Amino acid sequence: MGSGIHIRKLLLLGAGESGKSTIFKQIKLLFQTGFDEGELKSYVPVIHANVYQTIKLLHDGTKEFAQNETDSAKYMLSSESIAIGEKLSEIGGRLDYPRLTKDIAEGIETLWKDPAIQETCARGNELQVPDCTKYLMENLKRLSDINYIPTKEDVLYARVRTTGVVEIQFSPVGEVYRLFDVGGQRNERRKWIHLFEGVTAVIFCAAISEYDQTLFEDEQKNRMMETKELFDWVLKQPCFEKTSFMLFLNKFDIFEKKVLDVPLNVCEWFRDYQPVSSGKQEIEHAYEFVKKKFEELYYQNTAPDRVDRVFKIYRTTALDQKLVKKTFKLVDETLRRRNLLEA
Ligand SMILES: Nc1nc2c(ncn2[C@@H]2O[C@H](COP(=O)(O)OP(=O)(O)OP(O)(O)=S)[C@@H](O)[C@H]2O)c(=O)[nH]1
Numbered sequence: 011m012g013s014g015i016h017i018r019k020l021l022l023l024g025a026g027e028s029g030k031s032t033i034f035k036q037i038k039l040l041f042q043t044g045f046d047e048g049e050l051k052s053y054v055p056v057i058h059a060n061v062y063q064t065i066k067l068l069h070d071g072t073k074e075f076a077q078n079e080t081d082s083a084k085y086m087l088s089s090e091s092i093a094i095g096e097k098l099s100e101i102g103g104r105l106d107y108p109r110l111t112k113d114i115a116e117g118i119e120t121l122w123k124d125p126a127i128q129e130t131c132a133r134g135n136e137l138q139v140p141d142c143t144k145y146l147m148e149n150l151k152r153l154s155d156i157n158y159i160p161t162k163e164d165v166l167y168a169r170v171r172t173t174g175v176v177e178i179q180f181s182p183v184g185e186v187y188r189l190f191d192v193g194g195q196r197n198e199r200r201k202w203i204h205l206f207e208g209v210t211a212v213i214f215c216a217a218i219s220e221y222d223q224t225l226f227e228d229e230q231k232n233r234m235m236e237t238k239e240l241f242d243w244v245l246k247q248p249c250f251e252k253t254s255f256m257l258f259l260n261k262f263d264i265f266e267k268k269v270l271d272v273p274l275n276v277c278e279w280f281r282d283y284q285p286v287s288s289g290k291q292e293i294e295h296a297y298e299f300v301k302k303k304f305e306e307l308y309y310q311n312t313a314p315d316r317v318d319r320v321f322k323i324y325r326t327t328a329l330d331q332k333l334v335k336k337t338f339k340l341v342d343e344t345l346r347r348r349n350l351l352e353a
């Protein structure tokens with residue numbers, strides 16, 4: 011007879027921007043209380059910063075593209091849009107938390123309509139233009155409103171690179187989960203190893219939509235290749251001999267749009283992909299091909315004294331509250347059933 015308390019450690023791992031914190035926020039929303047008014051307002055400075063960050067990357071990329079174009083007026087901005095442009099890049103560089111006003115939103119919304127910016131957005135995958143860009147650019151009136159209060163959707167979009175280690179505790183529906191969120195950019199990974207003891211499950215986030223993108227850390231490195239190599243590295247860690255692996259193939263909502271426009275074949279790993287249909291048939295073909303690449307990667311890298319550990323794959327969109335709820339229930343049943351097996 012002991013205390014009766016069973017705390018199981020769960021670890022979010024994955025590359026920078028893969029969706030870990032987003033999953034983390036969903037867990038708090040599902041298994042604890044919903045964000046109260048003060049908590050919602052605390053994200054305004056982040057959301058506003060994101061808007062200036064996004065327009066800056068577009069404004070800078072246009073300058074990059076114009077220098078390499080020698081016989082085109084393609085990436086030359088208007089005069090008004092330059093008067094707006096330069097103003098914003100000044101503000102966003104001297105302030106970590108630039109405020110989005112009615113007037114600033116007007117300039118951005120005007121700068122967004124410039125064909126030079128649009129020509130830049132079209133080549134966004136060659137830049138670090140975030141996926142949420144269209145969303146932000148379409149909600150400026152709401153976001154710049156004097157009494158702006160962020161929605162759950164806003165907060166989940168809100169993007170901060172994680173630089174510390176945060177823990178939450180929850181029991182689904184004396185069994186408790188202790189869930190850790192940590193940064194996944196290369197420099198933050200130095201923090202990983204000290205978290206690796208006594209882990210019941212690793213929840214590894216793989217952003218499957220990034221197959222035509224390059225890293226923040228190294229703009230020459232394909233993002234999907236990094237995820238491949240990173241997952242590979244996690245799987246070989248001695249501490250994880252008995253740890254369950256829950257693989258979230260995340261950003262499926264983005265992957266769905268992208269695959270019918272950008273062939274999987276642009277990523278080295280997916281070089282031999284052959285399309286077979288159109289529409290939803292093709293999307294599912296492409297998904298199953300990616301999933302199979304990850305499965306094979308898993309078995310290729312799991313040695314015999316580890317092959318018995320649990321391994322599951324889930325297709326996720328971290329912004330989708332109902333899907334994360336249903337995904338987490340499956341994960342919990344699997345972990346419970348397994349712990350009950352080794353008893
Ligand atoms: N469309 C879409 N966007 C997503 C999805 N998952 C995460 N995002 C968005 O991607 C961005 C990065 O997500 P985030 O949760 O911060 O990644 P991270 O793994 O925590 O990144 P880091 O801390 O290691 S730098 C956020 O703006 C978030 O809203 C998704 O499934 N679909």
Ligand SMILES: [Cl-]
Pocket residue numbers: 344347
């Ligand atoms: Cl099972």
Ligand SMILES: [Mg+2]
Pocket residue numbers: 030031032170171172191192193194
């Ligand atoms: Mg994070």
